Amino acid sequence: QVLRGTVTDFPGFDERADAETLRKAMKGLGTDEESILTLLTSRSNAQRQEISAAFKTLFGRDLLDDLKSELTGKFEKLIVALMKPSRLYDAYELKHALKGAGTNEKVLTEIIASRTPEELRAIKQVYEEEYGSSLEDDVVGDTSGYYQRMLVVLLQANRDPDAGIDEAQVEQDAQALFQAGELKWGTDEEKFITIFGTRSVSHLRKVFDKYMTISGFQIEETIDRETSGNLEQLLLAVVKSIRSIPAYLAETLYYAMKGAGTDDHTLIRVMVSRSEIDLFNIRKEFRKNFATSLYSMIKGDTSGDYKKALLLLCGE
Ligand SMILES: [Ca+2]
Ligand SMILES: [Ca+2]
Ligand SMILES: [Ca+2]
Ligand SMILES: [Ca+2]
């Protein structure tokens, strides 16, 4: 999914001095938001958890409850997201798209399609431990049809391991996709799901090329031509992630920031979930496509402390 994040372990880290630094920034009338945003933004997540622990043993206070009572809005929502242990952030985001009453499919899609099987295994485990219920049971209860089925397949976190290309198998899957969509009166979604959901990543990159070659269409155009609604978005997320997780996340960031507004929720989530994985690589793919740094888009799209914090996450 990887290569590099923007946030790194600060050197000569002292969670006791940091905890006092944060106590100071909140103690009394007012909040020193800048001292908060600068400290939390230059501490890796593991270090934020140590701070939180030091704070509680120093003052008998919950750091998270204090930040929430001192901060407000998006900047708040961003600090809260940043304090969330890495291990639980995606489970949280997933939990939260499944509740409140109405289901947020863009969040299921985004996360399930862009995380690896190894990340999904981890995610399934912590969601169960944290919410009791099974991620899988919760998706299915809130979704239906091929969209639900495609998510269930991905949730198995059982994609074939990369392994030297079987050209006969590449031609057969490309031909199968050709026959299931373009040559078919209607569509065979089941075939798309099986191939997208279980073939190895190196194998599907090859299938996508062979598919183009055979049909004169990119698989994304076919998806657009043959599917609609939630399934379409997902199939496109999966294909884009196969091709490049970074590129898909960069793209996700972009469309978050271009409307007559800003998707703060989305914006936070990708910047925070990927800061210690591949935000760096998302940076370069943002520039590469869209032509513009993420810094400026963000810089031009956001205000305040929020803006400062975001840019602090992003860099260069
Ligand atoms: Ca205060
Ligand atoms: Ca608040
Ligand atoms: Ca068709
Ligand atoms: Ca369409």
Short mmCIF file of C-alpha atoms and ligand atoms in Angstrom, two decimals:
data_model
loop_
_atom_site.label_atom_id
_atom_site.label_comp_id
_atom_site.label_asym_id
_atom_site.label_seq_id
_atom_site.Cartn_x
_atom_site.Cartn_y
_atom_site.Cartn_z
CA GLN A 1 0.00 0.00 0.00
CA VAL A 2 3.16 1.64 1.02
CA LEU A 3 6.60 3.22 0.64
CA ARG A 4 6.49 6.48 2.79
CA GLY A 5 4.47 8.58 5.21
CA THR A 6 4.91 12.26 6.02
CA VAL A 7 4.90 11.79 9.82
CA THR A 8 7.86 10.27 11.59
CA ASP A 9 8.90 9.51 15.18
CA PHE A 10 10.17 12.71 16.78
CA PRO A 11 13.66 12.36 18.21
CA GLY A 12 14.47 12.85 21.83
CA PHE A 13 10.78 12.41 22.57
CA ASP A 14 9.74 13.03 26.17
CA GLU A 15 6.09 12.11 26.74
CA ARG A 16 6.24 13.71 30.25
CA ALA A 17 7.43 17.10 28.95
CA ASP A 18 4.93 16.84 26.08
CA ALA A 19 2.07 16.07 28.44
CA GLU A 20 3.02 19.15 30.47
CA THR A 21 3.34 21.14 27.34
CA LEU A 22 -0.24 20.13 26.46
CA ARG A 23 -1.54 20.73 30.03
CA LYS A 24 -0.09 24.28 29.74
CA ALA A 25 -1.71 24.92 26.34
CA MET A 26 -5.19 24.20 27.84
CA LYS A 27 -4.97 25.01 31.58
CA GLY A 28 -7.02 28.15 32.34
CA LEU A 29 -9.21 30.48 30.26
CA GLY A 30 -8.24 29.87 26.71
CA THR A 31 -6.49 27.40 24.54
CA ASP A 32 -3.09 27.77 22.87
CA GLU A 33 -4.28 25.94 19.72
CA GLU A 34 -0.98 26.52 17.95
CA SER A 35 1.03 24.77 20.64
CA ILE A 36 -1.34 21.79 20.36
CA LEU A 37 -1.33 21.60 16.54
CA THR A 38 2.47 21.91 16.42
CA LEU A 39 3.17 19.22 19.00
CA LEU A 40 0.62 16.56 17.92
CA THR A 41 1.57 17.03 14.30
CA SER A 42 5.27 16.27 14.98
CA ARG A 43 4.70 13.25 17.09
CA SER A 44 4.10 9.92 15.44
CA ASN A 45 0.83 8.19 16.51
CA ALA A 46 2.71 5.79 18.81
CA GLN A 47 4.23 8.85 20.46
CA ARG A 48 0.76 10.53 20.79
CA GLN A 49 -0.43 7.43 22.74
CA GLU A 50 2.55 7.71 25.10
CA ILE A 51 1.72 11.38 25.68
CA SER A 52 -1.85 10.50 26.44
CA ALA A 53 -0.59 7.94 28.99
CA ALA A 54 1.88 10.39 30.59
CA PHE A 55 -0.88 13.05 30.81
CA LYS A 56 -3.21 10.70 32.59
CA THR A 57 -0.50 9.59 35.08
CA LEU A 58 0.64 13.27 35.59
CA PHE A 59 -2.81 14.98 35.98
CA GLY A 60 -5.47 12.26 36.36
CA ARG A 61 -7.08 13.77 33.27
CA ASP A 62 -8.13 12.23 29.94
CA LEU A 63 -6.17 14.06 27.20
CA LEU A 64 -8.83 13.26 24.58
CA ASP A 65 -11.68 14.55 26.76
CA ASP A 66 -9.67 17.74 27.44
CA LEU A 67 -8.88 18.41 23.72
CA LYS A 68 -12.57 17.87 22.88
CA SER A 69 -13.68 20.40 25.50
CA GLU A 70 -11.02 22.91 24.47
CA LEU A 71 -11.24 22.58 20.68
CA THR A 72 -13.95 23.09 18.26
CA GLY A 73 -15.08 22.20 14.68
CA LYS A 74 -12.92 20.66 11.94
CA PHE A 75 -9.72 21.43 13.83
CA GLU A 76 -11.24 19.56 16.72
CA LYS A 77 -12.41 16.71 14.47
CA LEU A 78 -8.86 16.61 13.06
CA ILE A 79 -7.08 16.42 16.48
CA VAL A 80 -9.45 13.74 17.64
CA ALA A 81 -8.70 11.75 14.43
CA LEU A 82 -4.97 12.25 15.02
CA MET A 83 -5.21 10.93 18.63
CA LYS A 84 -6.96 7.78 17.50
CA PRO A 85 -4.52 4.84 17.70
CA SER A 86 -3.50 3.75 14.22
CA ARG A 87 -4.61 0.22 14.94
CA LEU A 88 -8.21 1.37 15.50
CA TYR A 89 -8.65 4.29 13.15
CA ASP A 90 -10.01 2.42 10.09
CA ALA A 91 -12.25 0.20 12.29
CA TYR A 92 -13.63 3.39 13.78
CA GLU A 93 -14.24 5.07 10.52
CA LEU A 94 -15.92 1.85 9.30
CA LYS A 95 -17.94 1.55 12.51
CA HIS A 96 -19.05 5.14 12.16
CA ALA A 97 -20.16 4.73 8.46
CA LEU A 98 -22.25 1.75 9.55
CA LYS A 99 -24.01 3.60 12.40
CA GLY A 100 -25.69 6.91 13.22
CA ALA A 101 -28.64 5.27 11.45
CA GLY A 102 -27.87 5.84 7.71
CA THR A 103 -24.93 4.08 6.01
CA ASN A 104 -22.15 6.04 4.34
CA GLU A 105 -21.15 3.83 1.36
CA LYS A 106 -18.36 6.11 0.25
CA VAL A 107 -16.50 5.23 3.46
CA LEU A 108 -17.03 1.42 3.17
CA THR A 109 -15.93 1.59 -0.49
CA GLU A 110 -12.90 3.75 0.13
CA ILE A 111 -11.46 1.75 2.95
CA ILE A 112 -12.34 -1.82 1.92
CA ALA A 113 -11.07 -1.28 -1.69
CA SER A 114 -7.82 0.51 -0.76
CA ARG A 115 -6.69 -1.61 2.19
CA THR A 116 -4.59 -4.70 1.69
CA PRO A 117 -5.72 -8.17 2.90
CA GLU A 118 -3.18 -7.92 5.75
CA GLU A 119 -4.66 -4.52 6.76
CA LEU A 120 -8.20 -5.93 6.42
CA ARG A 121 -7.32 -8.95 8.65
CA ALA A 122 -6.05 -6.52 11.34
CA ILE A 123 -9.08 -4.28 10.83
CA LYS A 124 -11.56 -7.14 11.23
CA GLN A 125 -9.92 -8.26 14.41
CA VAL A 126 -9.85 -4.83 16.17
CA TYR A 127 -13.45 -3.98 15.07
CA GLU A 128 -14.64 -7.16 16.74
CA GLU A 129 -12.62 -6.54 19.87
CA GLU A 130 -13.75 -2.87 19.94
CA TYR A 131 -17.43 -3.11 18.96
CA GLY A 132 -18.15 -6.73 19.74
CA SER A 133 -19.82 -7.41 16.47
CA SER A 134 -18.30 -8.73 13.27
CA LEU A 135 -17.37 -6.20 10.52
CA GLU A 136 -18.72 -8.56 7.98
CA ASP A 137 -21.99 -8.97 9.83
CA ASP A 138 -22.29 -5.22 10.04
CA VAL A 139 -21.56 -4.60 6.34
CA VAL A 140 -24.12 -7.11 5.14
CA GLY A 141 -26.78 -5.84 7.53
CA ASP A 142 -26.32 -2.36 6.11
CA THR A 143 -25.77 -3.24 2.43
CA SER A 144 -27.36 -5.37 -0.29
CA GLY A 145 -26.94 -6.89 -3.75
CA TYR A 146 -23.71 -7.07 -5.69
CA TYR A 147 -22.32 -4.11 -3.82
CA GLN A 148 -22.60 -6.11 -0.52
CA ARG A 149 -21.26 -9.27 -2.18
CA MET A 150 -18.23 -7.46 -3.64
CA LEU A 151 -17.51 -6.03 -0.17
CA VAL A 152 -17.93 -9.50 1.46
CA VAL A 153 -15.41 -10.92 -1.04
CA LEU A 154 -12.85 -8.22 -0.22
CA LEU A 155 -13.49 -8.66 3.51
CA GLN A 156 -12.32 -12.31 3.20
CA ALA A 157 -8.82 -10.80 2.69
CA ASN A 158 -7.99 -13.84 0.59
CA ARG A 159 -6.61 -12.51 -2.74
CA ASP A 160 -4.07 -14.83 -4.47
CA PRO A 161 -0.44 -14.05 -3.68
CA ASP A 162 1.69 -12.47 -6.41
CA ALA A 163 3.42 -15.25 -8.28
CA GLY A 164 4.77 -15.06 -11.81
CA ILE A 165 2.25 -14.54 -14.51
CA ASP A 166 0.39 -17.37 -16.16
CA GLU A 167 -0.28 -15.83 -19.59
CA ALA A 168 -3.00 -18.44 -20.38
CA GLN A 169 -4.75 -17.42 -17.17
CA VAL A 170 -4.36 -13.71 -18.06
CA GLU A 171 -5.97 -14.27 -21.51
CA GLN A 172 -8.79 -16.38 -19.97
CA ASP A 173 -9.68 -13.77 -17.32
CA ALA A 174 -9.52 -10.90 -19.89
CA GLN A 175 -11.77 -12.91 -22.28
CA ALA A 176 -14.08 -13.80 -19.37
CA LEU A 177 -14.48 -10.10 -18.46
CA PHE A 178 -15.02 -9.32 -22.17
CA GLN A 179 -17.81 -11.94 -22.39
CA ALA A 180 -19.38 -10.95 -18.99
CA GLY A 181 -19.77 -7.29 -19.94
CA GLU A 182 -19.32 -5.83 -23.44
CA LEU A 183 -20.34 -9.10 -25.36
CA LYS A 184 -23.20 -9.69 -23.00
CA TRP A 185 -26.75 -8.45 -23.25
CA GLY A 186 -26.84 -7.26 -19.61
CA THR A 187 -23.89 -8.07 -17.31
CA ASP A 188 -22.48 -11.04 -15.33
CA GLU A 189 -21.55 -9.19 -12.10
CA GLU A 190 -20.58 -12.38 -10.44
CA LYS A 191 -17.70 -12.84 -12.85
CA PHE A 192 -16.39 -9.33 -12.27
CA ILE A 193 -16.53 -9.80 -8.51
CA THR A 194 -14.69 -13.10 -8.47
CA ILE A 195 -11.94 -11.90 -10.73
CA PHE A 196 -11.58 -8.49 -9.13
CA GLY A 197 -11.84 -9.78 -5.61
CA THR A 198 -9.56 -12.87 -5.66
CA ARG A 199 -6.80 -12.69 -8.31
CA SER A 200 -3.42 -11.43 -7.23
CA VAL A 201 -2.55 -7.82 -7.80
CA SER A 202 0.28 -8.47 -10.36
CA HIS A 203 -2.08 -10.79 -12.23
CA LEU A 204 -4.92 -8.22 -12.47
CA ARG A 205 -2.59 -5.45 -13.68
CA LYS A 206 -1.74 -7.81 -16.56
CA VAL A 207 -5.46 -8.62 -17.08
CA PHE A 208 -6.28 -4.95 -17.27
CA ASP A 209 -3.74 -4.46 -20.12
CA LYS A 210 -4.79 -7.61 -22.00
CA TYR A 211 -8.41 -6.50 -21.59
CA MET A 212 -7.64 -3.14 -23.24
CA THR A 213 -5.80 -4.94 -26.04
CA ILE A 214 -8.70 -7.30 -26.74
CA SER A 215 -11.65 -4.92 -26.42
CA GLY A 216 -10.17 -1.48 -27.25
CA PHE A 217 -11.64 -0.33 -23.86
CA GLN A 218 -9.93 0.28 -20.52
CA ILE A 219 -11.60 -1.85 -17.79
CA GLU A 220 -12.82 1.41 -16.14
CA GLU A 221 -14.79 2.41 -19.24
CA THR A 222 -16.46 -0.98 -19.38
CA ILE A 223 -17.31 -0.68 -15.66
CA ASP A 224 -18.86 2.67 -16.44
CA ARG A 225 -20.69 1.23 -19.41
CA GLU A 226 -21.91 -1.95 -17.66
CA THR A 227 -22.51 -0.93 -14.09
CA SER A 228 -24.37 1.67 -12.02
CA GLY A 229 -24.79 2.89 -8.41
CA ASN A 230 -22.71 1.62 -5.51
CA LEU A 231 -21.32 -1.35 -7.42
CA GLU A 232 -19.83 0.94 -10.03
CA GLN A 233 -17.97 3.09 -7.52
CA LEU A 234 -16.60 0.10 -5.77
CA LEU A 235 -15.51 -1.71 -8.91
CA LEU A 236 -13.74 1.47 -9.91
CA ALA A 237 -12.17 1.79 -6.43
CA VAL A 238 -10.90 -1.73 -6.59
CA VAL A 239 -9.47 -1.33 -10.10
CA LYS A 240 -7.84 2.00 -9.23
CA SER A 241 -6.38 0.53 -6.02
CA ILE A 242 -4.96 -2.46 -7.93
CA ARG A 243 -3.32 -0.08 -10.24
CA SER A 244 -2.09 2.25 -7.47
CA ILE A 245 -3.38 2.63 -3.85
CA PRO A 246 -1.70 6.11 -3.70
CA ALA A 247 -3.16 7.24 -6.95
CA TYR A 248 -6.60 6.17 -5.85
CA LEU A 249 -6.23 7.99 -2.51
CA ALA A 250 -4.79 11.10 -4.27
CA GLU A 251 -7.75 11.06 -6.55
CA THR A 252 -10.01 10.58 -3.56
CA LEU A 253 -8.37 13.62 -1.91
CA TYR A 254 -8.79 15.74 -5.04
CA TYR A 255 -12.47 15.11 -5.67
CA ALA A 256 -12.81 15.84 -1.90
CA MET A 257 -11.46 19.32 -2.52
CA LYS A 258 -12.89 20.76 -5.63
CA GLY A 259 -16.63 20.96 -5.15
CA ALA A 260 -18.38 24.14 -4.15
CA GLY A 261 -16.95 23.20 -0.76
CA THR A 262 -14.67 20.63 0.90
CA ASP A 263 -15.18 17.06 2.15
CA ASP A 264 -13.60 17.57 5.55
CA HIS A 265 -14.53 14.15 6.79
CA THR A 266 -12.88 12.55 3.74
CA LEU A 267 -10.04 15.00 3.83
CA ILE A 268 -9.19 14.21 7.47
CA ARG A 269 -9.57 10.52 7.04
CA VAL A 270 -7.13 10.11 4.14
CA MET A 271 -4.61 12.53 5.57
CA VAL A 272 -4.76 10.97 8.99
CA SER A 273 -5.09 7.25 7.99
CA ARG A 274 -2.22 7.52 5.49
CA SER A 275 0.22 9.93 7.25
CA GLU A 276 2.39 7.11 8.43
CA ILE A 277 2.09 4.88 5.39
CA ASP A 278 2.07 6.52 1.97
CA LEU A 279 0.98 10.18 2.18
CA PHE A 280 4.32 10.99 0.70
CA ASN A 281 3.53 8.72 -2.29
CA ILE A 282 -0.04 10.23 -2.36
CA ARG A 283 1.65 13.63 -2.60
CA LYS A 284 3.61 12.73 -5.74
CA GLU A 285 0.52 11.05 -7.39
CA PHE A 286 -1.54 14.11 -6.58
CA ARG A 287 1.00 16.29 -8.38
CA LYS A 288 1.56 13.74 -11.11
CA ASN A 289 -2.14 13.62 -12.15
CA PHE A 290 -4.14 16.79 -11.12
CA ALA A 291 -1.06 19.04 -11.55
CA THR A 292 -0.92 20.95 -8.28
CA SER A 293 0.57 20.20 -4.92
CA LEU A 294 -1.66 18.88 -2.21
CA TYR A 295 -0.29 21.73 -0.05
CA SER A 296 -1.83 24.41 -2.26
CA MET A 297 -5.11 22.64 -2.80
CA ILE A 298 -5.40 22.26 0.97
CA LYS A 299 -3.96 25.70 1.55
CA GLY A 300 -6.47 27.17 -0.86
CA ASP A 301 -9.34 25.03 0.40
CA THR A 302 -8.99 25.28 4.19
CA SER A 303 -9.04 27.87 6.97
CA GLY A 304 -7.60 28.28 10.51
CA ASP A 305 -5.86 25.92 12.85
CA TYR A 306 -7.39 23.16 10.72
CA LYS A 307 -5.53 24.52 7.72
CA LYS A 308 -2.33 24.84 9.69
CA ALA A 309 -2.55 21.33 11.05
CA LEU A 310 -3.43 19.85 7.66
CA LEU A 311 -0.46 21.59 5.95
CA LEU A 312 1.66 20.45 8.82
CA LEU A 313 0.61 16.86 8.05
CA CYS A 314 1.08 17.23 4.30
CA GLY A 315 4.39 19.11 3.89
CA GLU A 316 6.57 20.65 1.11
CA CA B 1 -8.60 26.09 28.63
CA CA B 2 -15.30 20.61 21.40
CA CA B 3 -23.36 -5.83 -21.40
CA CA B 4 -22.12 4.10 -15.22
#
